Design an enzyme around this catalytic site. Structure first.
Site, PDB file in Angstrom:
ATOM      1  N   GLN A  19       0.892  -1.286  -0.032  1.00 23.74           N
ATOM      2  CA  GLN A  19       0.089   0.073  -0.051  1.00 23.74           C
ATOM      3  C   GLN A  19       0.899   1.198   0.047  1.00 23.74           C
ATOM      4  OE1 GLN A  19      -1.541  -0.974   4.195  1.00 23.74           O
ATOM      5  NE2 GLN A  19      -1.787   1.377   4.047  1.00 23.74           N
ATOM      6  N   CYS A  25      -5.146   0.439   3.794  1.00 19.79           N
ATOM      7  CA  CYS A  25      -5.391  -1.101   4.233  1.00 19.79           C
ATOM      8  C   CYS A  25      -6.665  -1.616   3.864  1.00 19.79           C
ATOM      9  CB  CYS A  25      -5.092  -1.181   5.653  1.00 19.79           C
ATOM     10  SG  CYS A  25      -6.168  -0.468   6.794  1.00 19.79           S
ATOM     11  N   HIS A 164      -6.115  -1.346  11.416  1.00 17.56           N
ATOM     12  CA  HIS A 164      -5.528  -2.054  10.334  1.00 17.56           C
ATOM     13  C   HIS A 164      -6.292  -3.101   9.626  1.00 17.56           C
ATOM     14  CE1 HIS A 164      -2.300  -2.232   7.516  1.00 17.56           C
ATOM     15  NE2 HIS A 164      -1.824  -3.445   7.985  1.00 17.56           N
ATOM     16  N   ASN A 185      -0.689  -9.173   5.164  1.00 14.49           N
ATOM     17  CA  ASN A 185      -0.387  -7.596   5.361  1.00 14.49           C
ATOM     18  C   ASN A 185      -0.404  -7.029   3.833  1.00 14.49           C
ATOM     19  OD1 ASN A 185      -0.481  -5.226   6.596  1.00 14.49           O
ATOM     20  ND2 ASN A 185       1.419  -5.669   7.378  1.00 14.49           N
TER      21      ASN A 185
HETATM   22  C1  LIG Z   1      -9.615  -1.879  10.759  1.00 14.08           C
HETATM   23  C2  LIG Z   1      -9.239  -0.380   9.604  1.00 14.08           C
HETATM   24  C3  LIG Z   1      -9.864  -1.111   8.145  1.00 14.08           C
HETATM   25  C4  LIG Z   1      -9.661   0.901  10.021  1.00 14.08           C
HETATM   26  C5  LIG Z   1      -9.454   1.752   8.893  1.00 14.08           C
HETATM   27  N1  LIG Z   1      -8.129   1.892   8.893  1.00 14.08           N
HETATM   28  C6  LIG Z   1      -7.538   2.167   7.526  1.00 14.08           C
HETATM   29  O1  LIG Z   1      -8.242   2.222   6.579  1.00 14.08           O
HETATM   30  C7  LIG Z   1      -6.161   2.697   7.298  1.00 14.08           C
HETATM   31  O2  LIG Z   1      -6.094   3.915   8.134  1.00 14.08           O
HETATM   32  C8  LIG Z   1      -5.009   1.868   7.884  1.00 14.08           C
HETATM   33  C9  LIG Z   1      -3.937   1.324   7.187  1.00 14.08           C
HETATM   34  O3  LIG Z   1      -2.921   0.820   7.607  1.00 14.08           O
HETATM   35  O4  LIG Z   1      -3.966   1.888   5.938  1.00 14.08           O
HETATM   36  C10 LIG Z   1     -10.212   3.091   9.419  1.00 14.08           C
HETATM   37  O5  LIG Z   1      -9.738   3.824  10.215  1.00 14.08           O
HETATM   38  N2  LIG Z   1     -11.318   3.365   8.920  1.00 14.08           N
HETATM   39  C11 LIG Z   1     -12.317   4.460   9.328  1.00 14.08           C
HETATM   40  C12 LIG Z   1     -13.679   3.968   9.819  1.00 14.08           C
HETATM   41  C13 LIG Z   1     -14.635   4.951  10.462  1.00 14.08           C
HETATM   42  C14 LIG Z   1     -15.171   4.606  11.748  1.00 14.08           C
HETATM   43  N3  LIG Z   1     -16.151   3.321  11.439  1.00 14.08           N
HETATM   44  C15 LIG Z   1     -15.880   2.057  11.966  1.00 14.08           C
HETATM   45  N4  LIG Z   1     -14.759   1.755  12.343  1.00 14.08           N
HETATM   46  N5  LIG Z   1     -16.977   0.938  11.906  1.00 14.08           N
END
Ligand SMILES: CC(C)C[C@H](NC(=O)[C@@H](O)CC(=O)O)C(=O)NCCCCNC(N)=[NH2+]
Length: 218
Positions: A19, A25, A164, A185
């Site tokens: 990435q 991710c 993540h 990963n």
């Molecule tokens: C577990 C992962 C997929 C959570 C997600 N993280 C990411 O997409 C990237 O920041 C992480 C990365 O390592 O690229 C994230 O922070 N998304 C925001 C979601 C907003 C709140 N809603 C939820 N968690 N239900």
């Protein structure tokens, strides 16, 4: 129910991806799980476009390099009637204009299954019977960043504060009798075990690996 599973051995897993410095991710986790399910249905492994998800799914609550969620992306793929191949819509690790081309579709989904929260048993059964599963983990600790070898067990992990999205491709038991999840990963091949981590299994949902697990339906 199998004692060990490695979907890499059964042709359901694409090469490690990277990435880079874009916080995308969720899109690799998404493409991972749908590559697995398209393979199981079709007999063909087709690498899928993370850039298509990044570029095109903002109305599903995904914010590209500023993060997203796997279920939201499976829904975008359902509503959109497909996702393009990696080869025709390659990864840029930047935000760009939606360039989805229905002629270059690599896979479709019709929805998804959420595994019950916290249930490593239902996660193992899904990995055994369906294939690779999208998971959210707590990857925040130095020990994860520097992970090189063996079974990762971070006592300081959260099961509920997850940052993540990654892919469970298998599970097993190491030579010290420690149960683990085999995790793909998206940090390229120079991280971990050529891009893979073994994460301790049946230790009270360590790092939240069963907190938010899902797979697409085809
Ligand atoms: C577990 C992962 C997929 C959570 C997600 N993280 C990411 O997409 C990237 O920041 C992480 C990365 O390592 O690229 C994230 O922070 N998304 C925001 C979601 C907003 C709140 N809603 C939820 N968690 N239900």
């Amino acid at each position: 129910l199998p004692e060990q599973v490695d979907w890499r051995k059964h042709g359901a897993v694409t090469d490690i991806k990277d990435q880079g410095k874009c916080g995308s991710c969720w899109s690799f986790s998404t493409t991972g799980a749908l590559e697995g399910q398209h393979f199981r249905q079709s007999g063909y492994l087709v690498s899928l476009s993370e850039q298509n998800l990044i570029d095109c799914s903002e109305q599903y609550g995904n914010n590209g390099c500023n993060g997203g969620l796997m279920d939201n992306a499976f829904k975008y793929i359902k509503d959109n009637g497909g996702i393009d191949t990696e080869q025709t819509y390659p990864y840029e690790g930047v935000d760009d204009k939606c360039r989805y081309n229905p002629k270059n579709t690599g896979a479709e989904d019709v929805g998804f299954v959420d595994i019950p929260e916290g249930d490593e048993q239902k996660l193992m059964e899904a990995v055994a019977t369906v294939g690779p599963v999208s998971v959210a983990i707590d990857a925040s600790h130095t020990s994860f960043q520097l992970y090189s070898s063996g079974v990762y067990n971070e006592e300081e992990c959260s099961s509920t504060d997850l940052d993540h999205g990654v892919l469970v491709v298998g599970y097993g038991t190491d030579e010290q009798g420690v149960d683990y999840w085999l995790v793909k990963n998206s940090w390229g091949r120079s991280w971990g075990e050529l891009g893979y981590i073994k994460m301790i299994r049946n230790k009270n949902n360590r790092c939240g690996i069963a907190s938010s697990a899902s797979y697409p339906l085809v």
